[PDB]
Amino acid sequence: ELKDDDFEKISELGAGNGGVVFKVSHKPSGLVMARKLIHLEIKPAIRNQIIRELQVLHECNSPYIVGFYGAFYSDGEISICMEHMDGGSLDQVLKKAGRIPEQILGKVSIAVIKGLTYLREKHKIMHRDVKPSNILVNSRGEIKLCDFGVSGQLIDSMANSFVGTRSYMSPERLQGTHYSVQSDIWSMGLSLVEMAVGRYPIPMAIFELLDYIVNEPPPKLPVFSLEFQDFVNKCLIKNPAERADLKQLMVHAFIKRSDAEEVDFAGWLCST
Numbered sequence: 001e002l003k004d005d006d007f008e009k010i011s012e013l014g015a016g017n018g019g020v021v022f023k024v025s026h027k028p029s030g031l032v033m034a035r036k037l038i039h040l041e042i043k044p045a046i047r048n049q050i051i052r053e054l055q056v057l058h059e060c061n062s063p064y065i066v067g068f069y070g071a072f073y074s075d076g077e078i079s080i081c082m083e084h085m086d087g088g089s090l091d092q093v094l095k096k097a098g099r100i101p102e103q104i105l106g107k108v109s110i111a112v113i114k115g116l117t118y119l120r121e122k123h124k125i126m127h128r129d130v131k132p133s134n135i136l137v138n139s140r141g142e143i144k145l146c147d148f149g150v151s152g153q154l155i156d157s158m159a160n161s162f163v164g165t166r167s168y169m170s171p172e173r174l175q176g177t178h179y180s181v182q183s184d185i186w187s188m189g190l191s192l193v194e195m196a197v198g199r200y201p202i203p204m205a206i207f208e209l210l211d212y213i214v215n216e217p218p219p220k221l222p223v224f225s226l227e228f229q230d231f232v233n234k235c236l237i238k239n240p241a242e243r244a245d246l247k248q249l250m251v252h253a254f255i256k257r258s259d260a261e262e263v264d265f266a267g268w269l270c271s272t
Ligand SMILES: C#Cc1ccc(Nc2c(C(=O)NOCCO)cc(/C=N/OCCO)c(F)c2F)c(F)c1
Pocket: 016, 017, 018, 019, 020, 036, 038, 057, 060, 065, 066, 067, 068, 080, 082, 128, 129, 145, 146, 147, 148, 149, 150, 151, 152, 154, 155, 156, 158, 161
């Protein structure tokens, strides 16, 4: 029940490849929500299938997944209306914070591996694009995941995804088609490491960045705590089967001392 005209544009939270979200007002309910607009050059049939498989998001309910209000089509634009996250993305936070704690990243990590196990064990789907620009947090202290693959057809229309300048892509997934869930870990790994070093931990046009990632060894860290090495790295193992699976890390030592401890996060964000 969300039509294009019951929407009033306020600003522009951000953009990217094919997408571009805005902060908008749903005129008829007064609610403030983020309106993603993917474009994609697709036909009516495939499109309707994308708009259809996107309804699954009404059953994607968890403190770790961004809230979703509706999805629909309008002028070559697939709209995905999700909750507004005033606190932006752990990417934006970065750009304005040089680097992030650990007592904190241990919290941003519980978010992620609890939101991944959710998507994997209640919707049988892997994220497939977990990274900072896709990890959002709110002023209320919450941390949630967004932009995950929920529409198989949307994942097929996004085939030309090896563009950009960075790449949270695991090695086995850059080599060919031998990959799945374990790939999300290398992603989260290459994230935690970047949210501890204020810059893409790797080490050059993308064709060369890719080749490098599969050839030489995975990043580590510069200076940094305990487990945040025996975790950031149990995440960067280039062999997918030797890397740690969610089950494991959900009991790993770094995680051990964290949901146990009591960091605020809220205030840190609110004042960072
Ligand atoms: C809550 C919630 C929520 C969950 C998901 C999305 N959006 C996507 C995006 C998505 O939005 N990606 O951002 C790009 C658009 O600019 C990409 C894919 C496809 N994956 O194919 C590329 C990986 O190989 C997909 F299937 C999606 F459903 C969302 F907007 C909100």
